[PDB]
mmCIF file with all atom_site columns, C-alpha atoms and ligand atoms in Angstrom:
data_model
loop_
_atom_site.group_PDB
_atom_site.id
_atom_site.type_symbol
_atom_site.label_atom_id
_atom_site.label_alt_id
_atom_site.label_comp_id
_atom_site.label_asym_id
_atom_site.label_entity_id
_atom_site.label_seq_id
_atom_site.pdbx_PDB_ins_code
_atom_site.Cartn_x
_atom_site.Cartn_y
_atom_site.Cartn_z
_atom_site.occupancy
_atom_site.B_iso_or_equiv
_atom_site.pdbx_formal_charge
_atom_site.auth_seq_id
_atom_site.auth_comp_id
_atom_site.auth_asym_id
_atom_site.auth_atom_id
_atom_site.pdbx_PDB_model_num
ATOM   1   C  CA  . UNK C 1 1   ? -111.197 51.768 42.039 1.00 43.38 ? 1   UNK C CA  1
ATOM   2   C  CA  . UNK C 1 2   ? -107.878 53.464 41.419 1.00 41.49 ? 2   UNK C CA  1
ATOM   3   C  CA  . UNK C 1 3   ? -104.175 52.827 42.002 1.00 43.68 ? 3   UNK C CA  1
ATOM   4   C  CA  . UNK C 1 4   ? -101.046 54.697 42.843 1.00 40.54 ? 4   UNK C CA  1
ATOM   5   C  CA  . UNK C 1 5   ? -97.354  54.038 43.219 1.00 39.51 ? 5   UNK C CA  1
ATOM   6   C  CA  . UNK C 1 6   ? -95.455  54.033 46.521 1.00 37.24 ? 6   UNK C CA  1
ATOM   7   C  CA  . UNK C 1 7   ? -93.667  57.216 45.948 1.00 38.71 ? 7   UNK C CA  1
ATOM   8   C  CA  . UNK C 1 8   ? -94.905  58.847 42.818 1.00 41.13 ? 8   UNK C CA  1
ATOM   9   C  CA  . UNK C 1 9   ? -97.856  58.744 40.595 1.00 40.18 ? 9   UNK C CA  1
ATOM   10  C  CA  . UNK C 1 10  ? -101.463 57.610 40.260 1.00 39.49 ? 10  UNK C CA  1
ATOM   11  C  CA  . UNK C 1 11  ? -103.785 56.023 37.725 1.00 39.60 ? 11  UNK C CA  1
ATOM   12  C  CA  . UNK C 1 12  ? -107.272 57.296 38.356 1.00 39.51 ? 12  UNK C CA  1
ATOM   13  C  CA  . UNK C 1 13  ? -110.746 55.779 38.148 1.00 37.96 ? 13  UNK C CA  1
ATOM   14  C  CA  . UNK C 1 14  ? -111.319 54.454 34.601 1.00 37.72 ? 14  UNK C CA  1
ATOM   15  C  CA  . UNK C 1 15  ? -107.779 53.216 34.092 1.00 39.31 ? 15  UNK C CA  1
ATOM   16  C  CA  . UNK C 1 16  ? -104.815 54.529 32.236 1.00 38.55 ? 16  UNK C CA  1
ATOM   17  C  CA  . UNK C 1 17  ? -101.051 54.102 32.246 1.00 39.41 ? 17  UNK C CA  1
ATOM   18  C  CA  . UNK C 1 18  ? -98.054  54.829 34.422 1.00 36.83 ? 18  UNK C CA  1
ATOM   19  C  CA  . UNK C 1 19  ? -94.324  54.359 34.464 1.00 37.09 ? 19  UNK C CA  1
ATOM   20  C  CA  . UNK C 1 20  ? -92.647  52.595 37.393 1.00 35.53 ? 20  UNK C CA  1
ATOM   21  C  CA  . UNK C 1 21  ? -88.916  52.405 38.184 1.00 38.52 ? 21  UNK C CA  1
ATOM   22  C  CA  . UNK C 1 22  ? -87.507  49.415 40.055 1.00 37.96 ? 22  UNK C CA  1
ATOM   23  C  CA  . UNK C 1 23  ? -84.218  48.732 41.812 1.00 37.88 ? 23  UNK C CA  1
ATOM   24  C  CA  . UNK C 1 24  ? -82.498  45.592 40.582 1.00 38.53 ? 24  UNK C CA  1
ATOM   25  C  CA  . UNK C 1 25  ? -79.578  43.691 42.055 1.00 39.92 ? 25  UNK C CA  1
ATOM   26  C  CA  . UNK C 1 26  ? -76.542  45.012 40.050 1.00 42.12 ? 26  UNK C CA  1
ATOM   27  C  CA  . UNK C 1 27  ? -74.968  41.571 39.671 1.00 43.18 ? 27  UNK C CA  1
ATOM   28  C  CA  . UNK C 1 28  ? -76.806  38.314 39.075 1.00 46.31 ? 28  UNK C CA  1
ATOM   29  C  CA  . UNK C 1 29  ? -75.374  34.938 37.931 1.00 46.08 ? 29  UNK C CA  1
ATOM   30  C  CA  . UNK C 1 30  ? -76.749  32.092 35.877 1.00 49.33 ? 30  UNK C CA  1
ATOM   31  C  CA  . UNK C 1 31  ? -78.920  30.066 38.215 1.00 48.70 ? 31  UNK C CA  1
ATOM   32  C  CA  . UNK C 1 32  ? -79.815  33.044 40.456 1.00 49.17 ? 32  UNK C CA  1
ATOM   33  C  CA  . UNK C 1 33  ? -82.982  35.153 40.537 1.00 46.84 ? 33  UNK C CA  1
ATOM   34  C  CA  . UNK C 1 34  ? -83.594  38.852 40.276 1.00 45.89 ? 34  UNK C CA  1
ATOM   35  C  CA  . UNK C 1 35  ? -86.767  39.332 42.328 1.00 45.12 ? 35  UNK C CA  1
ATOM   36  C  CA  . UNK C 1 36  ? -88.788  42.399 41.264 1.00 45.74 ? 36  UNK C CA  1
ATOM   37  C  CA  . UNK C 1 37  ? -91.453  42.785 43.949 1.00 44.23 ? 37  UNK C CA  1
ATOM   38  C  CA  . UNK C 1 38  ? -94.062  45.305 42.816 1.00 39.59 ? 38  UNK C CA  1
ATOM   39  C  CA  . UNK C 1 39  ? -96.262  44.793 45.858 1.00 37.18 ? 39  UNK C CA  1
ATOM   40  C  CA  . UNK C 1 40  ? -94.146  47.344 47.745 1.00 38.30 ? 40  UNK C CA  1
ATOM   41  C  CA  . UNK C 1 41  ? -94.801  49.898 44.925 1.00 37.90 ? 41  UNK C CA  1
ATOM   42  C  CA  . UNK C 1 42  ? -98.269  49.536 43.427 1.00 33.98 ? 42  UNK C CA  1
ATOM   43  C  CA  . UNK C 1 43  ? -101.267 49.989 45.730 1.00 30.55 ? 43  UNK C CA  1
ATOM   44  C  CA  . UNK C 1 44  ? -104.966 50.022 44.838 1.00 28.39 ? 44  UNK C CA  1
ATOM   45  C  CA  . UNK C 1 45  ? -108.251 50.619 46.649 1.00 29.38 ? 45  UNK C CA  1
ATOM   46  C  CA  . UNK C 1 46  ? -112.024 50.144 46.280 1.00 31.43 ? 46  UNK C CA  1
ATOM   47  C  CA  . UNK C 1 47  ? -113.887 53.477 46.357 1.00 33.89 ? 47  UNK C CA  1
ATOM   48  C  CA  . UNK C 1 48  ? -117.270 52.045 47.500 1.00 33.24 ? 48  UNK C CA  1
ATOM   49  C  CA  . UNK C 1 49  ? -116.586 48.834 49.406 1.00 28.97 ? 49  UNK C CA  1
ATOM   50  C  CA  . UNK C 1 50  ? -120.057 48.802 51.034 1.00 27.66 ? 50  UNK C CA  1
ATOM   51  C  CA  . UNK C 1 51  ? -121.962 48.297 47.812 1.00 25.81 ? 51  UNK C CA  1
ATOM   52  C  CA  . UNK C 1 52  ? -119.388 47.276 45.255 1.00 26.83 ? 52  UNK C CA  1
ATOM   53  C  CA  . UNK C 1 53  ? -116.856 44.495 45.025 1.00 22.73 ? 53  UNK C CA  1
ATOM   54  C  CA  . UNK C 1 54  ? -113.838 45.061 42.768 1.00 20.86 ? 54  UNK C CA  1
ATOM   55  C  CA  . UNK C 1 55  ? -112.065 42.167 40.993 1.00 17.58 ? 55  UNK C CA  1
ATOM   56  C  CA  . UNK C 1 56  ? -108.431 42.546 39.948 1.00 18.93 ? 56  UNK C CA  1
ATOM   57  C  CA  . UNK C 1 57  ? -106.349 40.265 37.705 1.00 19.13 ? 57  UNK C CA  1
ATOM   58  C  CA  . UNK C 1 58  ? -102.945 40.306 36.105 1.00 16.21 ? 58  UNK C CA  1
ATOM   59  C  CA  . UNK C 1 59  ? -104.292 40.297 32.562 1.00 18.23 ? 59  UNK C CA  1
ATOM   60  C  CA  . UNK C 1 60  ? -100.934 40.043 30.931 1.00 17.65 ? 60  UNK C CA  1
ATOM   61  C  CA  . UNK C 1 61  ? -97.239  40.347 31.642 1.00 15.61 ? 61  UNK C CA  1
ATOM   62  C  CA  . UNK C 1 62  ? -94.747  41.124 28.904 1.00 21.56 ? 62  UNK C CA  1
ATOM   63  C  CA  . UNK C 1 63  ? -90.962  41.374 28.814 1.00 17.76 ? 63  UNK C CA  1
ATOM   64  C  CA  . UNK C 1 64  ? -88.940  43.981 26.960 1.00 16.28 ? 64  UNK C CA  1
ATOM   65  C  CA  . UNK C 1 65  ? -85.343  44.914 26.253 1.00 13.58 ? 65  UNK C CA  1
ATOM   66  C  CA  . UNK C 1 66  ? -82.716  43.054 28.212 1.00 15.99 ? 66  UNK C CA  1
ATOM   67  C  CA  . UNK C 1 67  ? -85.278  41.067 30.162 1.00 15.47 ? 67  UNK C CA  1
ATOM   68  C  CA  . UNK C 1 68  ? -86.947  39.800 27.013 1.00 15.25 ? 68  UNK C CA  1
ATOM   69  C  CA  . UNK C 1 69  ? -83.507  39.041 25.515 1.00 12.15 ? 69  UNK C CA  1
ATOM   70  C  CA  . UNK C 1 70  ? -81.377  37.807 28.453 1.00 8.93  ? 70  UNK C CA  1
ATOM   71  C  CA  . UNK C 1 71  ? -83.722  36.339 31.104 1.00 7.68  ? 71  UNK C CA  1
ATOM   72  C  CA  . UNK C 1 72  ? -86.209  33.574 31.650 1.00 3.99  ? 72  UNK C CA  1
ATOM   73  C  CA  . UNK C 1 73  ? -88.990  34.393 34.092 1.00 4.01  ? 73  UNK C CA  1
ATOM   74  C  CA  . UNK C 1 74  ? -91.934  33.525 36.269 1.00 3.40  ? 74  UNK C CA  1
ATOM   75  C  CA  . UNK C 1 75  ? -94.511  35.788 37.799 1.00 2.00  ? 75  UNK C CA  1
ATOM   76  C  CA  . UNK C 1 76  ? -96.078  35.344 41.208 1.00 2.00  ? 76  UNK C CA  1
ATOM   77  C  CA  . UNK C 1 77  ? -99.575  36.774 41.536 1.00 2.00  ? 77  UNK C CA  1
ATOM   78  C  CA  . UNK C 1 78  ? -101.373 36.568 44.867 1.00 2.00  ? 78  UNK C CA  1
ATOM   79  C  CA  . UNK C 1 79  ? -99.792  33.285 45.975 1.00 2.00  ? 79  UNK C CA  1
ATOM   80  C  CA  . UNK C 1 80  ? -99.591  31.478 42.582 1.00 2.00  ? 80  UNK C CA  1
ATOM   81  C  CA  . UNK C 1 81  ? -96.850  31.254 39.954 1.00 2.00  ? 81  UNK C CA  1
ATOM   82  C  CA  . UNK C 1 82  ? -96.911  31.585 36.187 1.00 2.00  ? 82  UNK C CA  1
ATOM   83  C  CA  . UNK C 1 83  ? -94.626  31.826 33.178 1.00 2.00  ? 83  UNK C CA  1
ATOM   84  C  CA  . UNK C 1 84  ? -93.425  35.337 32.498 1.00 2.00  ? 84  UNK C CA  1
ATOM   85  C  CA  . UNK C 1 85  ? -94.194  36.437 29.817 1.00 2.00  ? 85  UNK C CA  1
ATOM   86  C  CA  . UNK C 1 86  ? -97.666  35.267 30.756 1.00 2.00  ? 86  UNK C CA  1
ATOM   87  C  CA  . UNK C 1 87  ? -99.748  32.795 28.732 1.00 2.00  ? 87  UNK C CA  1
ATOM   88  C  CA  . UNK C 1 88  ? -103.123 33.901 30.022 1.00 2.00  ? 88  UNK C CA  1
ATOM   89  C  CA  . UNK C 1 89  ? -105.072 36.122 32.405 1.00 2.00  ? 89  UNK C CA  1
ATOM   90  C  CA  . UNK C 1 90  ? -104.886 35.075 36.066 1.00 2.00  ? 90  UNK C CA  1
ATOM   91  C  CA  . UNK C 1 91  ? -107.563 34.354 38.606 1.00 2.00  ? 91  UNK C CA  1
ATOM   92  C  CA  . UNK C 1 92  ? -108.897 37.420 40.358 1.00 2.00  ? 92  UNK C CA  1
ATOM   93  C  CA  . UNK C 1 93  ? -108.112 39.105 43.606 1.00 2.00  ? 93  UNK C CA  1
ATOM   94  C  CA  . UNK C 1 94  ? -110.789 40.919 45.575 1.00 2.00  ? 94  UNK C CA  1
ATOM   95  C  CA  . UNK C 1 95  ? -110.497 44.575 46.549 1.00 2.00  ? 95  UNK C CA  1
ATOM   96  C  CA  . UNK C 1 96  ? -113.111 45.245 49.231 1.00 2.00  ? 96  UNK C CA  1
ATOM   97  C  CA  . UNK C 1 97  ? -111.672 48.129 51.268 1.00 2.00  ? 97  UNK C CA  1
ATOM   98  C  CA  . UNK C 1 98  ? -111.011 51.856 50.970 1.00 2.00  ? 98  UNK C CA  1
ATOM   99  C  CA  . UNK C 1 99  ? -107.580 51.279 52.490 1.00 2.00  ? 99  UNK C CA  1
ATOM   100 C  CA  . UNK C 1 100 ? -104.701 50.881 50.062 1.00 2.00  ? 100 UNK C CA  1
ATOM   101 C  CA  . UNK C 1 101 ? -103.787 47.298 49.518 1.00 2.00  ? 101 UNK C CA  1
ATOM   102 C  CA  . UNK C 1 102 ? -100.803 46.144 47.523 1.00 2.00  ? 102 UNK C CA  1
ATOM   103 C  CA  . UNK C 1 103 ? -101.127 44.717 44.028 1.00 2.62  ? 103 UNK C CA  1
ATOM   104 C  CA  . UNK C 1 104 ? -99.507  41.372 44.801 1.00 2.00  ? 104 UNK C CA  1
ATOM   105 C  CA  . UNK C 1 105 ? -97.232  40.860 41.751 1.00 2.00  ? 105 UNK C CA  1
ATOM   106 C  CA  . UNK C 1 106 ? -93.549  39.816 41.703 1.00 4.06  ? 106 UNK C CA  1
ATOM   107 C  CA  . UNK C 1 107 ? -91.222  38.817 38.878 1.00 4.10  ? 107 UNK C CA  1
ATOM   108 C  CA  . UNK C 1 108 ? -88.534  36.160 39.258 1.00 3.01  ? 108 UNK C CA  1
ATOM   109 C  CA  . UNK C 1 109 ? -85.984  36.563 36.476 1.00 2.00  ? 109 UNK C CA  1
ATOM   110 C  CA  . UNK C 1 110 ? -83.026  34.313 35.864 1.00 2.85  ? 110 UNK C CA  1
ATOM   111 C  CA  . UNK C 1 111 ? -80.339  34.998 33.215 1.00 2.82  ? 111 UNK C CA  1
ATOM   112 C  CA  . UNK C 1 112 ? -80.235  32.673 30.232 1.00 4.22  ? 112 UNK C CA  1
ATOM   113 C  CA  . UNK C 1 113 ? -76.858  31.175 29.271 1.00 5.58  ? 113 UNK C CA  1
ATOM   114 C  CA  . UNK C 1 114 ? -76.175  33.731 26.503 1.00 7.47  ? 114 UNK C CA  1
ATOM   115 C  CA  . UNK C 1 115 ? -76.365  36.613 29.031 1.00 9.09  ? 115 UNK C CA  1
ATOM   116 C  CA  . UNK C 1 116 ? -73.063  38.258 29.924 1.00 9.54  ? 116 UNK C CA  1
ATOM   117 C  CA  . UNK C 1 117 ? -72.059  41.854 30.534 1.00 4.98  ? 117 UNK C CA  1
ATOM   118 C  CA  . UNK C 1 118 ? -74.706  44.512 30.926 1.00 4.33  ? 118 UNK C CA  1
ATOM   119 C  CA  . UNK C 1 119 ? -77.819  42.377 30.500 1.00 6.59  ? 119 UNK C CA  1
ATOM   120 C  CA  . UNK C 1 120 ? -80.222  45.178 31.528 1.00 7.27  ? 120 UNK C CA  1
ATOM   121 C  CA  . UNK C 1 121 ? -79.511  48.843 30.922 1.00 6.59  ? 121 UNK C CA  1
ATOM   122 C  CA  . UNK C 1 122 ? -80.287  51.566 33.420 1.00 3.56  ? 122 UNK C CA  1
ATOM   123 C  CA  . UNK C 1 123 ? -83.399  53.491 32.508 1.00 3.30  ? 123 UNK C CA  1
ATOM   124 C  CA  . UNK C 1 124 ? -84.577  50.927 29.901 1.00 3.54  ? 124 UNK C CA  1
ATOM   125 C  CA  . UNK C 1 125 ? -88.048  49.381 29.725 1.00 3.11  ? 125 UNK C CA  1
ATOM   126 C  CA  . UNK C 1 126 ? -87.977  45.845 31.086 1.00 2.42  ? 126 UNK C CA  1
ATOM   127 C  CA  . UNK C 1 127 ? -91.639  44.812 31.442 1.00 6.32  ? 127 UNK C CA  1
ATOM   128 C  CA  . UNK C 1 128 ? -95.290  45.776 31.061 1.00 2.13  ? 128 UNK C CA  1
ATOM   129 C  CA  . UNK C 1 129 ? -97.844  44.459 33.551 1.00 2.00  ? 129 UNK C CA  1
ATOM   130 C  CA  . UNK C 1 130 ? -101.515 45.061 32.846 1.00 2.00  ? 130 UNK C CA  1
ATOM   131 C  CA  . UNK C 1 131 ? -103.969 45.217 35.735 1.00 2.00  ? 131 UNK C CA  1
ATOM   132 C  CA  . UNK C 1 132 ? -107.515 44.528 34.604 1.00 2.00  ? 132 UNK C CA  1
ATOM   133 C  CA  . UNK C 1 133 ? -110.303 45.636 36.940 1.00 2.00  ? 133 UNK C CA  1
ATOM   134 C  CA  . UNK C 1 134 ? -114.001 44.814 36.913 1.00 2.00  ? 134 UNK C CA  1
ATOM   135 C  CA  . UNK C 1 135 ? -116.739 44.721 39.577 1.00 2.00  ? 135 UNK C CA  1
ATOM   136 C  CA  . UNK C 1 136 ? -120.084 43.211 40.641 1.00 2.00  ? 136 UNK C CA  1
ATOM   137 C  CA  . UNK C 1 137 ? -122.071 46.372 40.005 1.00 2.00  ? 137 UNK C CA  1
ATOM   138 C  CA  . UNK C 1 138 ? -121.910 47.520 36.393 1.00 2.00  ? 138 UNK C CA  1
ATOM   139 C  CA  . UNK C 1 139 ? -120.048 46.920 33.127 1.00 2.00  ? 139 UNK C CA  1
ATOM   140 C  CA  . UNK C 1 140 ? -116.805 48.683 34.090 1.00 2.00  ? 140 UNK C CA  1
ATOM   141 C  CA  . UNK C 1 141 ? -113.869 46.818 32.644 1.00 2.00  ? 141 UNK C CA  1
ATOM   142 C  CA  . UNK C 1 142 ? -110.685 48.921 32.915 1.00 2.00  ? 142 UNK C CA  1
ATOM   143 C  CA  . UNK C 1 143 ? -106.998 48.505 32.264 1.00 2.00  ? 143 UNK C CA  1
ATOM   144 C  CA  . UNK C 1 144 ? -104.232 49.929 34.422 1.00 2.00  ? 144 UNK C CA  1
ATOM   145 C  CA  . UNK C 1 145 ? -100.992 49.681 32.490 1.00 2.00  ? 145 UNK C CA  1
ATOM   146 C  CA  . UNK C 1 146 ? -97.713  49.629 34.373 1.00 2.00  ? 146 UNK C CA  1
ATOM   147 C  CA  . UNK C 1 147 ? -94.571  50.173 32.380 1.00 2.00  ? 147 UNK C CA  1
ATOM   148 C  CA  . UNK C 1 148 ? -91.673  48.915 34.430 1.00 2.00  ? 148 UNK C CA  1
ATOM   149 C  CA  . UNK C 1 149 ? -88.277  50.571 33.999 1.00 2.00  ? 149 UNK C CA  1
ATOM   150 C  CA  . UNK C 1 150 ? -84.855  49.510 35.320 1.00 2.00  ? 150 UNK C CA  1
ATOM   151 C  CA  . UNK C 1 151 ? -83.328  51.949 37.731 1.00 2.00  ? 151 UNK C CA  1
ATOM   152 C  CA  . UNK C 1 152 ? -79.807  50.622 37.197 1.00 2.00  ? 152 UNK C CA  1
ATOM   153 C  CA  . UNK C 1 153 ? -77.574  48.412 35.050 1.00 2.00  ? 153 UNK C CA  1
ATOM   154 C  CA  . UNK C 1 154 ? -77.594  44.717 35.795 1.00 2.00  ? 154 UNK C CA  1
ATOM   155 C  CA  . UNK C 1 155 ? -74.479  42.682 35.010 1.00 2.00  ? 155 UNK C CA  1
ATOM   156 C  CA  . UNK C 1 156 ? -74.332  38.961 34.355 1.00 2.00  ? 156 UNK C CA  1
ATOM   157 C  CA  . UNK C 1 157 ? -70.760  37.941 35.271 1.00 2.00  ? 157 UNK C CA  1
ATOM   158 C  CA  . UNK C 1 158 ? -69.016  36.280 32.354 1.00 2.00  ? 158 UNK C CA  1
HETATM 159 C  C1  . LIG S 2 .   ? -127.493 51.488 44.224 1.00 2.00  ? 201 LIG S C1  1
HETATM 160 O  O1  . LIG S 2 .   ? -126.648 52.644 44.291 1.00 2.00  ? 201 LIG S O1  1
HETATM 161 C  C2  . LIG S 2 .   ? -125.325 52.297 44.209 1.00 2.00  ? 201 LIG S C2  1
HETATM 162 O  O2  . LIG S 2 .   ? -124.935 51.133 44.105 1.00 2.00  ? 201 LIG S O2  1
HETATM 163 C  C3  . LIG S 2 .   ? -124.338 53.489 44.295 1.00 2.00  ? 201 LIG S C3  1
HETATM 164 C  C4  . LIG S 2 .   ? -122.981 53.138 44.944 1.00 2.00  ? 201 LIG S C4  1
HETATM 165 C  C5  . LIG S 2 .   ? -122.167 54.443 45.029 1.00 2.00  ? 201 LIG S C5  1
HETATM 166 C  C6  . LIG S 2 .   ? -121.847 55.069 43.666 1.00 2.00  ? 201 LIG S C6  1
HETATM 167 C  C7  . LIG S 2 .   ? -120.892 54.201 42.816 1.00 2.00  ? 201 LIG S C7  1
HETATM 168 C  C8  . LIG S 2 .   ? -120.674 54.931 41.478 1.00 2.00  ? 201 LIG S C8  1
HETATM 169 C  C9  . LIG S 2 .   ? -119.624 54.284 40.560 1.00 2.00  ? 201 LIG S C9  1
HETATM 170 C  C10 . LIG S 2 .   ? -118.212 54.325 41.221 1.00 2.00  ? 201 LIG S C10 1
HETATM 171 O  O3  . LIG S 2 .   ? -117.280 53.723 40.315 1.00 2.00  ? 201 LIG S O3  1
HETATM 172 C  C11 . LIG S 2 .   ? -115.849 53.626 40.621 1.00 2.00  ? 201 LIG S C11 1
HETATM 173 O  O4  . LIG S 2 .   ? -115.504 52.920 41.869 1.00 2.00  ? 201 LIG S O4  1
HETATM 174 C  C12 . LIG S 2 .   ? -115.986 51.561 41.857 1.00 2.00  ? 201 LIG S C12 1
HETATM 175 C  C13 . LIG S 2 .   ? -115.656 50.856 43.170 1.00 2.00  ? 201 LIG S C13 1
HETATM 176 O  O5  . LIG S 2 .   ? -114.248 50.845 43.377 1.00 2.00  ? 201 LIG S O5  1
HETATM 177 C  C14 . LIG S 2 .   ? -115.376 50.822 40.713 1.00 2.00  ? 201 LIG S C14 1
HETATM 178 O  O6  . LIG S 2 .   ? -115.944 49.506 40.702 1.00 2.00  ? 201 LIG S O6  1
HETATM 179 C  C15 . LIG S 2 .   ? -115.740 51.479 39.393 1.00 2.00  ? 201 LIG S C15 1
HETATM 180 O  O7  . LIG S 2 .   ? -115.087 50.752 38.336 1.00 2.00  ? 201 LIG S O7  1
HETATM 181 C  C16 . LIG S 2 .   ? -115.200 52.903 39.460 1.00 2.00  ? 201 LIG S C16 1
HETATM 182 O  O8  . LIG S 2 .   ? -113.803 52.760 39.648 1.00 2.00  ? 201 LIG S O8  1
HETATM 183 NI NI1 . LIG S 2 .   ? -110.401 56.647 45.827 1.00 2.00  ? 202 LIG S NI1 1
#
């Protein structure tokens, strides 16, 4: 089991960390969502699907910077929704193929009332999503840590 990003880097077998940049709508109002869909960017695969089944959860989601300070959030993981920042590890998703399959995670972020002006700075860390991977074969239990960075400023119209 390993993962890689759409158009950049990889986390190899055994886990590790990687930095991911996301495009964000440049203007969002109170009551509207920024949708950050990571399933078009993070892809994982099972390296031995014939003998091993891999299990993948969103172990934890954390907010940082302007997201932590200026937005309220939910996370969608494989068809279900949760508070973001998360309050516990999610059910698991099965990886059973050598073909790349998306990691099905998306954030829905909505500005809080106190947000106004540049609520998220270009280049700043906005979230960390931890992918935890185990299997039905041995005691492997690995973390794939995705630091999510804002590509651009996001403005909440005052
Ligand atoms: C009875 O013999 C076997 O079951 C050997 C099966 C082929 C060798 C498998 C060696 C271990 C491969 O491990 C990697 O690939 C596995 C499958 O993706 C992951 O579950 C592991 O965590 C790790 O990422
Ligand atoms: Ni591989």
